[PDB]
C-alpha cells in the first residue's frame, strides 16, 4: 500500500492532472468536456537506478533491476476558482505537495496564490514548485518566470523550494521531478499505536492519518446520518483495497477504500471517544488580503451573525458567528463536526457570490 500523500495544487488548466498522467500514466478519467471535478486518484512505484518507474533500469545505463524506494500516491485537485472548497478538503490527507505553475501565463494567477497560501497556512511545508508548459515557450520566457518565482519564494516561507520546469505533455524532465520528490517530500513516520482515525472524501473511500485499520474490525462513521440530530453508523470492515490490489490491513499515506454521501465524514474505532459538536470554539487569524480571485481587496474583520464556510478536516460545513473576540470566535453549525483531537481548520467567506479563503485557526476543546 502507498506510503505517502502528495498533493498537486495550482491554478486551472496549468495541467495538474496532465503532470499526474506523465508520472503515473493514470488519468483522473475526467468532467470530460470540462476538467477534473472530483479529486483525481493515482498511485506509482519509485525505484532507482543505483547502477525509474518500473522495475527496469535497462532504460538508462544498464540492467540491474532498480531498487524499490517506496510506492507513493497523489491527489489531483481541481484548478477552478470555485472548486476551492474541495481542494481545501483534500489537503487534509496530504503529506506534501507540488505547485504546478504554467510557463505561458502571468505567474501569480488567482488560484495559484490562493492555493500557495492555503498550503503555508494548513501546514503542508514540504513543497516543490513546478514550471509546466515550457514545451510551448521562449528559452528566455521560462527563465524570467523562474525569476518572478525565485522572488515570490522569498519573503514567504519558501527558502529553497526548488523549481523543476517540466513538459507534462511530452513527459520531459519528469525524472528530475522524481528526484526532487525523492529528496524533499520525505515519508513521515506515524505511530501506529495511536487511535485508529481516518478522513473520507469519496464513497461508492478516504485516507488514514493516524493508527491502522485491519480486515474484520468493528467501526463507526461520524457524525453519521441525521434525523435534527446526527448519529454514528456502525459496520464491519468488509474489505481493504489500495489501488486495484487488495490488502489485509491499511496504514497512513495513501487513499484507501451512493453518490458520495458520507463525504466529509470520518471513520474511527467502534467504541471510541470523539465529540460530535454543534458549536465550536475557534482560535484564529486573518490574511491582510484576499489572495485568490483573478482583485486583492483587504479582508474585513469578522462581524457576528455572519455565515462562513468552516472547512474542518475533509469535511466542508457552513456556520454562523455567535462570538467575536481577538482570536477566539464561537461558531454554530448546520452539520456536526466530529472533533477527533485538538486540530486544524480553514475559514472562508462569500465575497462576490463565489466563496473565498480568508483566514484560519485551531479548533478548541
Amino acid at each position: 500500500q502507498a506510503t505517502i500523500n502528495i498533493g498537486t495544487i495550482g491554478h486551472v488548466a496549468h495541467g495538474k492532472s496532465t503532470v499526474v498522467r506523465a508520472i503515473s500514466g493514470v488519468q483522473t478519467v475526467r468532467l470530460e468536456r470540462n476538467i477534473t471535478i472530483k479529486l483525481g486518484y493515482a498511485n506509482a512505484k519509485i525505484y532507482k537506478c543505483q547502477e525509474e518507474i518500473s522495475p527496469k533500469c535497462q532504460r538508462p545505463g544498464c540492467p540491474g533491476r532498480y531498487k524499490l524506494v517506496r510506492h507513493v500516491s497523489f491527489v489531483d485537485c481541481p484548478g477552478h476558482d470555485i472548486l476551492m472548497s474541495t481542494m481545501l478538503s483534500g489537503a487534509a490527507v496530504m503529506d506534501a505537495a507540488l505547485l504546478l505553475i504554467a510557463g505561458n501565463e502571468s505567474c501569480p494567477q488567482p488560484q495559484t496564490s490562493e492555493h500557495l497560501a492555503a498550503i503555508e497556512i494548513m501546514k503542508l511545508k514540504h513543497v516543490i514548485i513546478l514550471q509546466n508548459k515550457v514545451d510551448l515557450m521562449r528559452e528566455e520566457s521560462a527563465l524570467e518566470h523562474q525569476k518572478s518565482i525565485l522572488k515570490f519564494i522569498r519573503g514567504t516561507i519558501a527558502d529553497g523550494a526548488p523549481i523543476v520546469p517540466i513538459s507534462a505533455q511530452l513527459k520531459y524532465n519528469i525524472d528530475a521531478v522524481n528526484e526532487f520528490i525523492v529528496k524533499t517530500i520525505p515519508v513521515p513516520p506515524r505511530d501506529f499505536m495511536i487511535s485508529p482515525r481516518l478522513i473520507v472524501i469519496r464513497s461508492f473511500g478516504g485516507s488514514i492519518l493516524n493508527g491502522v485499520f485491519k480486515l474484520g474490525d468493528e467501526i463507526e462513521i461520524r457524525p453519521g446520518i441525521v434525523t435534527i440530530q446526527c448519529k454514528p453508523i456502525f459496520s464491519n470492515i468488509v474489505s481493504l483495497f489500495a489501488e486495484q490490489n487488495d490488502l489485509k490491513f491499511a496504514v497512513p499515506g495513501g487513499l484507501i477504500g451512493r453518490a458520495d454521501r458520507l463525504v466529509g465524514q470520518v471513520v474511527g474505532a467502534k467504541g471510541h471517544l470523539p465529540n460530535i459538536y454543534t458549536d465550536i470554539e475557534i482560535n484564529y487569524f486573518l490574511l491582510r488580503r484576499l489572495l485568490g480571485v483573478k482583485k486583492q481587496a483587504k479582508v474585513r474583520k469578522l462581524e457576528p451573525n455572519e455565515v462562513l464556510m468552516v472547512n474542518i478536516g475533509s469535511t466542508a460545513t457552513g456556520a454562523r458567528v455567535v462570538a467575536v473576540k481577538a482570536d477566539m470566535a464561537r461558531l454554530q453549525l448546520t452539520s456536526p463536526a466530529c472533533t477527533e483531537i485538538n486540530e486544524k481548520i480553514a475559514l472562508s467567506r462569500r465575497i462576490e457570490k463565489h466563496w473565498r479563503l480568508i483566514g484560519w485557526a485551531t479548533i478548541k476543546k
Binding site: 527563465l143 525565485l150 526548488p162 520546469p165 517540466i166 513538459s167 520531459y172 524532465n173 528530475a176
Partner: peptide, 17 residues
C-alpha cells in the same frame, strides 16, 4: 541558488522536437 535550476532548464530544452 540558480545554478542547479538553470542547469534543469538547459537539460529540458535540449530534449525538444
Amino acid at each position: 541558488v540558480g545554478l542547479p535550476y538553470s542547469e534543469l532548464l538547459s537539460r529540458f530544452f535540449n530534449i525538444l522536437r
